[PDB]
Design an enzyme around this catalytic site. Structure first.
Site, PDB file in Angstrom:
ATOM      1  N   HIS A 122       0.812  -1.210   0.000  1.00  8.69           N
ATOM      2  CA  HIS A 122       0.000   0.000   0.000  1.00  8.69           C
ATOM      3  C   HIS A 122       0.849   1.264   0.000  1.00  8.69           C
ATOM      4  O   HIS A 122       0.311   2.356   0.215  1.00  8.69           O
ATOM      5  CB  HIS A 122      -0.991  -0.008   1.175  1.00  8.69           C
ATOM      6  CG  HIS A 122      -0.409   0.367   2.503  1.00  8.69           C
ATOM      7  ND1 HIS A 122      -0.045   1.657   2.825  1.00  8.69           N
ATOM      8  CD2 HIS A 122      -0.191  -0.372   3.616  1.00  8.69           C
ATOM      9  CE1 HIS A 122       0.402   1.690   4.068  1.00  8.69           C
ATOM     10  NE2 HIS A 122       0.325   0.471   4.570  1.00  8.69           N
ATOM     11  N   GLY A 129       3.612   6.575   8.977  1.00  7.29           N
ATOM     12  CA  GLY A 129       4.906   6.390   8.363  1.00  7.29           C
ATOM     13  C   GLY A 129       5.771   5.317   8.987  1.00  7.29           C
ATOM     14  O   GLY A 129       6.847   5.022   8.449  1.00  7.29           O
ATOM     15  N   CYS A 171       4.840   2.302   8.989  1.00 11.88           N
ATOM     16  CA  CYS A 171       4.588   1.120   8.178  1.00 11.88           C
ATOM     17  C   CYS A 171       5.878   0.659   7.513  1.00 11.88           C
ATOM     18  O   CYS A 171       6.717   1.472   7.115  1.00 11.88           O
ATOM     19  CB  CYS A 171       3.528   1.413   7.117  1.00 11.88           C
ATOM     20  SG  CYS A 171       1.864   1.594   7.781  1.00 11.88           S
TER      21      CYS A 171
END
Lengths: 304, 304
Positions: B41, B143, B145
């Site tokens: 993503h 962020g 991730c």
């Protein structure tokens, strides 16, 4: 989202851990530039530790009696000195992995990461606070001596702690990287007591602000209090007195949440007098005091 | 002495964290050999996240649309693929810091260290458990991730987790390094519920054994119990059923303390039915379940 007791990344310090061996004793050392720092009681046996005359013991040692091993690279010792309670072994090889570093003496209530080691090799990393009584509640086994505590600010590793002793009490005592003990403790196996510990009030308030940022609000109250009336309650519960400097340090958190410090203090007052009544705050059933106002800001804003 | 929630040394993983940037979105990636792993993503905007057709979105991307940055070394992308929920970006430069590594899919109840990052740079490290309901209680901001969880066995880094989503619930969900989510979760901003969490009974018992090793014995009782009678109590308190495999796994701890597992289970029974009555165990007022039997052995024997 979420709030965890978080250690600094330990990579920069791993590259600095070496195995120091004088005689039979082996403990961890810290290799920076062309110098290796380790507890001076590496020159002691368990029998010497009762009451060692360190000057007399070190005078029986020569450079060739100190066996420093960085993984597989055996360093050659070309100098040795005793600074307070630490040995400074001059070696021929400068550590190519030496980070930008400082030595600092932290104050009680401040936090730092510990890289626990055994035989010069890292075992794990955990965050801890310098208690008001200058002990730390760590995890240390035989041979973990020489493990160091540190903070990282952008590029620089600020070394602040080196582990020396486990007291009969089970608590841990150590020095700064100049060899000056935190607290009244000495590096011999004699009877030593830590003294009354207290809770770091400013840190608890930081952690309550952390809880608000993360959705836990059930302790926020309408009441307020005075700095002088709160400290009357704190002293009863062995909480360190809250100063105006502490209030100022919480300013950034107070602004981010729209909760006045003294309003937060009033909530804590209630928690101290009535307890949690079975509830939890950030997944804890006790009031946590190992988070500084800066630790909360760091973790709540993603400092890199 | 002492017992702390302890993360693995993170150095080997720091050298692997890179900044991945597709379009406006920037998240962390993991650079091993000549491949960079990151949440798929990263190719989405916040608008796409409602219901992205990932195949259609990736087909609009070319190698030159993916900006990988390892500190200051900008890597060149020469290939791209989607494996389940992760992107595999082939780059021209092999990471000179690639450790001996494996990809593993852990089971619920197992622990691992998380290196939290932002913009490809490490922020901190903490230990966590894969909950029975396949969530984790971490600390993640926007962020973070692409931050990964891992274990270290001697020389090898076993990567087991990559962070993808913060659920509306506040809990965190992610995948293995093959991109297969732990649990029922999907990588879109839809309504997702974790399901009933339970306590990792085998871990609580490990932590009670840890407490005995460290001097805390006030919960040891004369009673014993049956595995089948204990589980009748556990089910009432949303504790995962204790199997015979769990009993066998506790064998090493049972031997080191001279306390039969089923005797420890009887102590836990009492703790669940009557509580702690204001006492603490290893400085906690709640029953801790993020320590595996191996975590306790590791920390209580100084594994390097």
């Amino acid at each position: 989202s979420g709030f965890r007791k978080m250690a600094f990344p330990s990579g920069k310090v791993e590259g600095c851990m070496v195995q120091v061996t004088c005689g039979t004793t082996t403990l961890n050392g810290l290799w920076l530039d062309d110098v290796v720092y380790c507890p001076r009681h590496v020159i002691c046996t368990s029998e010497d530790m009762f009451n060692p005359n360190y000057e007399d013991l070190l005078i029986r040692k020569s450079n060739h009696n100190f066996l420093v091993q960085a993984g597989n690279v055996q360093l050659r010792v070309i100098g040795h000195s005793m600074q307070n309670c630490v040995l400074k072994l001059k070696v021929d090889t400068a550590n190519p992995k030496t980070p930008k570093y400082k030595f600092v003496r932290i104050q009680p209530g401040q936090t730092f990461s510990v890289l626990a080691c055994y035989n010069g090799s890292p075992s794990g990393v955990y965050q801890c606070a310098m208690r008001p009584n200058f002990t730390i509640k760590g995890s240390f086994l035989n041979g973990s001596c020489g493990s160091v505590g540190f903070n990282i600010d952008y590029d620089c590793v600020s070394f602040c702690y080196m582990h020396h002793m486990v007291l009969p009490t089970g608590v841990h005592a150590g020095t700064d990287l100049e060899g000056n003990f935190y607290g009244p403790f000495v590096d011999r196996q004699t009877a030593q007591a830590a003294g009354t510990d207290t809770t770091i009030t400013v840190n608890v308030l930081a952690w309550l602000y952390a809880a608000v940022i993360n959705g836990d609000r059930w302790f926020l109250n309408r009441f307020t209090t005075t700095l002088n009336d709160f400290n009357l309650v704190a002293m009863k519960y062995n909480y360190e007195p809250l100063t105006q400097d502490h209030v100022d340090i919480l300013g950034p958190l107070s602004a981010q949440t729209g909760i006045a410090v003294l309003d937060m203090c009033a909530s804590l007052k209630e928690l101290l007098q009535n307890g949690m009544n079975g509830r939890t705050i950030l997944g804890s059933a006790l009031l946590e005091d190992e988070f500084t106002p800066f630790d909360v800001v760091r973790q709540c804003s993603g400092v890199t």
